[PDB]
Design a protein around this ligand. Sequence first.
Ligand SMILES: CC(=O)N[C@@H]1[C@@H](O)[C@H](O)[C@@H](CO)O[C@H]1O
Ligand SMILES: CC(=O)N[C@@H]1[C@@H](O)[C@H](O)[C@@H](CO)O[C@H]1O
Ligand SMILES: CC(=O)N[C@@H]1[C@@H](O)[C@H](O)[C@@H](CO)O[C@H]1O
Ligand SMILES: CC(=O)N[C@@H]1[C@@H](O)[C@H](O)[C@@H](CO)O[C@H]1O
Length: 359
Amino acid sequence: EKSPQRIMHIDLDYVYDENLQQMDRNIDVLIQRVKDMQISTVYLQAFADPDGDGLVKEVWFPNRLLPMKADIFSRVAWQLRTRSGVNIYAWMPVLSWDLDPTLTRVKYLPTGEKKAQIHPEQYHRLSPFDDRVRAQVGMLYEDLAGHAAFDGILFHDDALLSDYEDASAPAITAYQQAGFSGSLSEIRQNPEQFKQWARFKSRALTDFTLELSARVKAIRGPHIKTARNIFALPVIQPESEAWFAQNYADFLKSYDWTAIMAMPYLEGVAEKSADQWLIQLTNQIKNIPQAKDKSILELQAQNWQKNGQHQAISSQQLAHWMSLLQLNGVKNYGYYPDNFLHNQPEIDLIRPEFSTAWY
Ligand SMILES: CC(=O)N[C@@H]1[C@@H](O)[C@H](O)[C@@H](CO)O[C@H]1O
Ligand SMILES: CC(=O)N[C@@H]1[C@@H](O)[C@H](O)[C@@H](CO)O[C@H]1O
Ligand SMILES: CC(=O)N[C@@H]1[C@@H](O)[C@H](O)[C@@H](CO)O[C@H]1O
Ligand SMILES: CC(=O)N[C@@H]1[C@@H](O)[C@H](O)[C@@H](CO)O[C@H]1O
């Protein structure tokens, strides 16, 4: 993969239309847009997400376990790879799949409550400590690998656990067999075990993704690249691994690419403070030898609302941030999401700061 990496992170929900002729024209416009952008890589959504409700119910490829909304991942992928000049990473949830109800869900232990529960503001994750979950998610990745050709896998940011998770019964068994003492409440407040417990969960998530990678590689071959989205806080505030179960050094060792969600508004940073936040992030990265060479900084192109009506970030603002990254010595970056239907971000404003081939 030739340097630098410039990544468009693309949902196919926009492309989908019940009218097949319209969907055809949509795909054509998308392929041309990516070609015109002249960048290196597309992270391409393989799952449907029409409602943004943190749970995958349908996918864009034929498979054994979930409804196929439309057979379009493979179709878009091969055209992007041959007409638009990009590598394609299949973007897949790690855990948040609407599978058999008897499969174990991740739960958290609420303060003051005895029974573990599912938090409504979190991804609706299956538990990585349930071996049948591992098998069935494995089957989904195998079905993707068998039907479509691509260059890499992007593991979704839903591979995370808080310091009150996973409280499910199979997770409890896993902790017990690993030597952890007492209840989840006791472990997480034990000075001598809570850091080890955090690391155990981080390793469990990573090991699960590496199992999935191995299964895809068994089908498509060894050259398949891996990437995983990491939240910004585990990078800039490493103690936060306690409530993310993500470790930046672990990512850098385990994956070809660590896709950092360099998204200040997502993190609640004020508009007037966002640039400084990004500078501090890049400083932290540059202080770890060679980290920047295996990291992609992923900027946000929408400002997401709990309300649900997301708001676009101006093309000028996105270009400004891209310029900021370059000026601070960061050459690998991209953005999420892209909206071909409205030329948002505006290709003519973004290319000068995004395409190495510009002017
Ligand atoms: C935070 C996040 O993932 N937001 C995405 C949004 O950018 C995208 O346009 C929409 C359509 O797929 O789905 C949402 O989930
Ligand atoms: C509110 C809802 O139905 N689902 C949300 C989803 O929108 C969000 O992307 C995810 C991660 O915060 O958490 C889920 O619980
Ligand atoms: C069958 C099932 O899992 N139902 C849960 C529900 O009990 C919970 O209140 C809600 C919180 O988001 O998430 C649902 O998935
Ligand atoms: C507020 C803060 O800075 N960090 C908290 C952490 O102390 C807490 O244990 C965790 C609970 O899931 O939520 C984080 O946001």
